[PDB]
Amino acid sequence: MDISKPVGSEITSVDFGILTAKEIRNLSAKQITNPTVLDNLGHPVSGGLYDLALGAFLRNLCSTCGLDEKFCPGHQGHIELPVPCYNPLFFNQLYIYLRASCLFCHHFRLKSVEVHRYACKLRLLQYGLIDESYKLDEITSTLLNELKSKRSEYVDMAIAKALSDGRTTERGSFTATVNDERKKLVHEFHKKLLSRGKCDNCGMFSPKFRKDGFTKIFETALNEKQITNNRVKGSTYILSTEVKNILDTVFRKEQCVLQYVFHSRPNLSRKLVKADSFFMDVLVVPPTRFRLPSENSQNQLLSKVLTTSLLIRDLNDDLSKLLEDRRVIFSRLMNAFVTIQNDVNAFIDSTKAVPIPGVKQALEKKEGLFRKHMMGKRVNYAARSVISPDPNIETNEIGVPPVFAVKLTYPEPVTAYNIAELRQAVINGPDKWPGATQIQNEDGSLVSLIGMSVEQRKALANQLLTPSSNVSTHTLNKKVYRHIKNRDVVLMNRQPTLHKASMMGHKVRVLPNEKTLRLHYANTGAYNADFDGDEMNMHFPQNENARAEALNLANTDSQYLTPTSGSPVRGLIQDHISAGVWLTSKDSFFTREQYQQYIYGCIRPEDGHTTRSKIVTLPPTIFKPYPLWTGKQIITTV
């Protein structure tokens, strides 16, 4: 992040949705069709997974935006599936709505006056009307047209009453406790929807379905005991085009109910919810940037989709050519319906179809994506080394070696006050402390100082503070990536960081010789850090916002009292406690020379410790035969 390159727009909200098939045809760059990735001569095949329309690839320009590898953002493509297949993210809920629906009127089998009740209770819960949904149950062929009026009139009455009495915006109120009553009510809805015998509108049965797991679907044999209601009314692997040819007609008759089942927030967009939303007629391939070879496993899963996709296209050529051939071509085409289903199952979910890791298993657990790369990240401008104990350091500081002080760097924008100490720093160069490793120019340029001699490097010290040559950059200034000085700030951090005082903000103080981090003894009570080869992380913040927090807020002097009990966790440990039993003895007497040497050896006014600009002393305890100072009187004047 550069503090001189801002950003105008910020994300306010996100909302989860489903790609329809019209979008990802208009969204796409170029549809790809053959299940080969790259042919001979090293160049990828056009029409395959690695394609120059999906992004730049291995010193070859993008066929969509015309940018090289360092600047092409990557582009998504789509592959066509000949049959609408199931989405394994939604088969657990598709089979709920695949069941619980009569196959004749294409309503649900539960009665339409009570399906109207859940559509009125879940409308009130979209708004902040958790109370009035229980008052709705108190509202109780001709009277059902008026009962469905009285319930719907009360819902419309209670919304406009609450929306005018400053209580709930038309965006709806959605707290935690209305998410409780909503999930409880939809579980109540889906429970007694499935447990139905006959449709209460057209009073007859419907053949029950069987879930084989994933990848398949089966209907069962309708019993001879209850086929008689199917005559006085006036097993088979069914297709995935036969499932959609019901659930389209189901989700049209009952739009007013699933408009509020599938929406937590009130639907101001008025998008109709569809049964195509549960299938996926068109896969989306990720861009070629996100599936570069290690080939890659997502190119292997998409290969078997496209390998099946040409078999099932060639199997449909014989269906245009046509009885013995018609029998065998269709019991083998239907074998290809399960396999192209089983591929897009194994593409998304490797556990619902040893195996190739799918798209879901790049997200789920630890060593995944949310916990391995979003909540926790590898960081820049950071360091790690073994700590060794160190007195003589002022208890809010860290001792950084020269091997750390040369690599780690900080962007100082040049001003009137910098150009005395930051001109000298840019003369010293990358391999001298305190130095500088780069200069970031006004126009976002970057001039590395490593391969420069002392004459060119002193020349850029005078180009450093110049008025800008451009109107478009007339308000910016150059940033010198200087070395870390003794005024910078550092986050020291020892694992396991079990409490917040195990990650503190220290000042810095370089050491000129030795190659290890050095920590004062009053910090080992907080980090749980004995010095038996333990190492700990050092983080160097890169802007003035984070410098002002690891000095004032996450400072190590702020963290004297732990918040567990309120007790102090900072103090001296082994030799200082034994020395103070000897120094504060009654036997300890010090002469005039030994007294004044112990006081200056710990105060040192030139390092900003005393408050008087002159070390004041006490009269001695004993005056004659010769003056002596007791050790109680050392710590008094200290």
């Binding site: 503090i3 390159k5 801002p6 950003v7 007339h474 308000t475």
Partner: protein, 176 residues
């Protein structure tokens, strides 16, 4: 056909213009915008009048000198909404423009509109009866329907507006 648009613009503001904030909106976002083409305005922005920063806190009067600017959390640049009245010269099709002759060639008629803006009239827009005389010395002229060389104004109608390059261009026919 100079028209007036009142706009609203969400701009940045650097800390060197924290003592003179109306100056900083002019020198960063408005003075690089005069004599250019802007898409959401409609045509070529000539100038502006009446720059007023919309204050952050709405409890302040319009008479107040001090106003609040919402600083970016990351960077020290501040953001604000402003109202200003741009004046913009916009060409549209079917309109008649006064021209000044700059190029007399056998391919196009490159002329200037209001001494600043380029324009052209193509060969296929020029009809059959308007022939061209050659100049072996130095650039001739198109002999009109009545036999006289053209000079001064040339009132044509707009065919298409071409703002894609550096400057605006106006395509035009020579019929009624």
């Amino acid at each position: 056909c100079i028209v007036r648009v009142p706009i609203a613009l969400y701009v940045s503001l650097a800390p060197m213009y924290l003592e003179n904030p109306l100056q900083g909106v002019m020198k960063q976002h408005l003075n690089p915008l005069v004599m250019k083409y802007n898409n959401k305005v409609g045509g070529v922005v000539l100038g502006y009048e009446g720059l007023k920063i919309l204050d952050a806190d709405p409890l302040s009067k319009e008479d107040t000198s001090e106003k609040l600017i919402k600083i970016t959390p990351d960077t020290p640049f501040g953001f604000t909404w402003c109202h200003v009245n741009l004046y913009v010269w916009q060409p549209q099709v079917g309109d008649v423009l006064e021209g000044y002759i700059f190029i007399q060639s056998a391919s196009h008629i490159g002329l200037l509109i209001h001494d600043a803006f380029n324009a052209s009239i193509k060969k296929n827009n020029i009809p059959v009866d308007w022939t061209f005389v050659h100049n072996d010395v130095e650039l001739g002229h198109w002999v009109d329907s009545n036999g006289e060389p053209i000079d001064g104004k040339l009132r044509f109608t707009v065919r298409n507006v071409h703002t894609t390059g550096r400057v605006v261009s106006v395509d035009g026919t020579l019929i009624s």
